[PDB]
Write an enzyme that holds these catalytic residues in place. Sequence first.
Site, PDB file in Angstrom:
ATOM      1  N   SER A   7      -8.091 -63.757  -7.117  1.00 40.18           N
ATOM      2  CA  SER A   7      -7.596 -62.303  -7.423  1.00 40.18           C
ATOM      3  C   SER A   7      -7.745 -61.094  -6.448  1.00 40.18           C
ATOM      4  CB  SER A   7      -8.754 -61.981  -8.771  1.00 40.18           C
ATOM      5  OG  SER A   7      -9.232 -63.178  -9.402  1.00 40.18           O
ATOM      6  N   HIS A  66      -2.095 -66.573  -8.792  1.00 40.10           N
ATOM      7  CA  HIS A  66      -3.302 -65.995  -9.447  1.00 40.10           C
ATOM      8  C   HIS A  66      -2.595 -66.375 -11.018  1.00 40.10           C
ATOM      9  CE1 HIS A  66      -5.940 -63.320 -11.378  1.00 40.10           C
ATOM     10  NE2 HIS A  66      -5.166 -62.379 -11.261  1.00 40.10           N
ATOM     11  N   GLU A  93       1.113 -64.789 -11.033  1.00 42.92           N
ATOM     12  CA  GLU A  93       1.258 -63.829  -9.845  1.00 42.92           C
ATOM     13  C   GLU A  93       1.462 -64.687  -8.792  1.00 42.92           C
ATOM     14  OE1 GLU A  93      -1.835 -60.536 -10.124  1.00 42.92           O
ATOM     15  OE2 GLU A  93      -0.078 -59.326 -10.073  1.00 42.92           O
ATOM     16  N   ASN A 122      -4.090 -56.466 -11.291  1.00 38.54           N
ATOM     17  CA  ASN A 122      -5.231 -55.780 -11.499  1.00 38.54           C
ATOM     18  C   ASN A 122      -5.171 -54.370 -10.718  1.00 38.54           C
ATOM     19  OD1 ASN A 122      -7.245 -59.007 -10.863  1.00 38.54           O
ATOM     20  ND2 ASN A 122      -6.755 -57.379 -12.606  1.00 38.54           N
TER      21      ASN A 122
END
Lengths: 283, 283
Positions: free
Chosen positions: A118, A139, A151, A189
Amino acid sequence: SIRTVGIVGAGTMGNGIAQACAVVGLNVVMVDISDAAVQKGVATVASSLDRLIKKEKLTEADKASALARIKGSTSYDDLKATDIVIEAATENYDLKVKILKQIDGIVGENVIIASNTSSISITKLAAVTSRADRFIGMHFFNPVPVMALVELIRGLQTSDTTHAAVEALSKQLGKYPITVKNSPGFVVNRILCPMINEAFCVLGEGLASPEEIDEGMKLGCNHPIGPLALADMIGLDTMLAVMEVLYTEFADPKYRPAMLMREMVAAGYLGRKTGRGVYVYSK
Amino acid sequence: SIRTVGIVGAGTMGNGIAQACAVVGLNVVMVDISDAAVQKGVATVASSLDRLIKKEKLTEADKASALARIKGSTSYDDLKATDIVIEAATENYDLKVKILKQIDGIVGENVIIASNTSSISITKLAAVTSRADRFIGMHFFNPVPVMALVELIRGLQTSDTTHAAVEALSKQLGKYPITVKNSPGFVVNRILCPMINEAFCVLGEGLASPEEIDEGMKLGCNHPIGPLALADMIGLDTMLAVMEVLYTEFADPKYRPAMLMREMVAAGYLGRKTGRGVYVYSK
Ligand SMILES: NC(=O)c1ccc[n+]([C@@H]2O[C@H](COP(=O)([O-])OP(=O)(O)OC[C@H]3O[C@@H](n4cnc5c(N)ncnc54)[C@H](O)[C@@H]3O)[C@@H](O)[C@H]2O)c1
Ligand SMILES: NC(=O)c1ccc[n+]([C@@H]2O[C@H](COP(=O)([O-])OP(=O)(O)OC[C@H]3O[C@@H](n4cnc5c(N)ncnc54)[C@H](O)[C@@H]3O)[C@@H](O)[C@H]2O)c1
C-alpha cells in the site's frame, strides 16, 4: 504465457490472490514458513469457497477443481516452477527486501517479480533485484476474491513488457487493473485518505458531530460509508501512518495529519480493532 | 409553530423548497420579480409532480392538494403572512444583502430569516439584519424534492431557539438536517471538494489516466461516481471557485487549487455545461 503464479506469503492477501488465480484455472505455488501457515492458508480458501457454494455460486466440482491447481509449498525452490512470483508477506521494509532478494536468487532472469504493498516505494524495491525492469507493484483490495480492481504500480524501471503481462494477468483474474506511476499513496489512498483526514479536521475543530459529518457525506455524496466510520474500520493507526507517509514522502504540510487523529492514536483508540476510535463498539 | 414558509426566489432551488414544503401540507408564499419567473416556478413543480404521478408515487389528488398551499406572489409584503422566510435567489453578495434587508424590513421581529448558500459566510449575512439571532444558514441539495438532507449553518449569532425551530421544520420536510458552525465549505463541500482537487492533482502530475483514476475510486471505495466525472457534472468553474474560497478564507495553501483545474477553467473547458472538461461530451 503465464499459467503458473508464484506466491510468497499465505495470509489474508496471499490466499486472496491464490484463490483469485485458482478459480480461473491458474496454477498457484503458495509458499510460507511453516506447514501451519500454508494449510491455514488453504483453510480460508476452502471456507470461502464453501460460502460460495452456499449462495448458489459455482459449484461443488469447481471448489474441488480450483484447489487441485494450488500447490502449497514451504520450500522456496518450488518457484522455479513459476511464470511470476508475487510477494505478499510483509509491509516491513528490511524484511521485504530480504524476501525479494531470496526470490530474485531462485527464479530465472525473465520471470517477473511483483510486490503487493500500500505504501512502500516500488522503485526502491525494484532497485534491490538484479533485473529491475522485470519488477512491478501490485496493490490488491482487502477482501481479494470479490474486489474487482488492482493498482498496478510501475517503478521507474518497470518495462512496458513487464507491464502488459501483469496487466493481462490482472484482466484474466477478472479484475480491472489501474496503472499508476510509483508515488506516495498511488491513486486510491492518495485521494481517499486525505479526505478521511479532512473529516477529522472538521470534527477536530468542533464544527459538527461525527454522526452528522458521516451523514453529511452518505446522503450528500451518496458515499456508502461515512469517512469517520470508514476510518474506524481501516484503523486510525493505519490512517495516521498513511498521512505520515504522504507528509514525509512529499515533504509538504498540505498533508499534515489531523491533530485529533494523532490523539486518538496516542490514546489507543484505534477503531473497531480496539473497540473504540471515533465511535465506541461492542467488543 | 411554523405553518407558513416565506420563499424569496422561484428558480431551481426556490420551487425545490416550495414543493418540499407543499407535499407536506405547509403553506408556501413564493416571491420573485416577474409573473413569468413565478409561474415558471409553478410549472417545474407541476412537471415534477406529474413525473411522480407517472411512477406510482402519490397521487392525482395530492398534486392538486400541494399546489393549493402554494401562494405565488410578486409583491414582497405577502411575507407578513409567513412564519419564516428563506432567501434563495442569488449567490451574489451585494444583492443577497439587499434582499435580506428588504425582507428584514417587512417581516416582524420574531420571524426567522434564512439564506440558502454554498459559500457565503452566514455570520456576515446575519450581521446585516436587525435581529442576527433570528438568522440562520441553510444549504439544500441540488435536486431538492428527493435529496434527503440540509446543512443547517449557525452564524455566530444564531440562537438555540432559531436553531431548534428550523431543525424541526427540516425534519418535517422529511430531510435529515446536519448542524454546522459557519466555516468555509461547511461540512460537505469542505471535505468533498478538496478530494476532487486531489484527483486533479493526480491527473495533473501524469500518474494515471482520468478513466483509471475514476475507476480506482468507484471500485476501490465504492463511490457512485468518480471524482473527475463528478467535477465535470458540478462545473470546474464551480469547483475552482470553491477551492479559491477555501484557500482565501483559511489563508492556507493546503487548499491550493490544482493547476490543471485552473487551466481547464481558463480554457473554457468547464465540464458537461460546455461539452468539455476532463472528458468530452456529445452536445
Ligand atoms: N491486510 C492489509 O491490510 C493489506 C492491505 C493492502 C496491502 N497489504 C500488503 O500485503 C501484505 C500481507 O498482509 P496479509 O494481510 O496477508 O497479512 P497476514 O497477517 O494475514 O499474513 C501474513 C503472512 O505472510 C507470511 N510471511 C511472513 N514472513 C514471511 C517470509 N519471510 N516468507 C514467506 N512468508 C512470510 C506469514 O507467515 C503470514 O502467513 C502486507 O504486509 C502488505 O504489504 C496488506
Ligand atoms: N443551483 C445551485 O447550483 C445551488 C446549489 C446550492 C446553493 N445554491 C443557492 O441558491 C441560490 C439560487 O439558485 P437557483 O439554482 O434557484 O438559481 P436559478 O437560476 O434556477 O433561479 C434564480 C431565481 O432567483 C430569482 N431572483 C433573482 N433576484 C431576485 C430578487 N431580488 N428577488 C426575488 N427573486 C430574485 C430569479 O428571478 C430566479 O427565478 C443560488 O444563488 C445559491 O445561493 C445554488
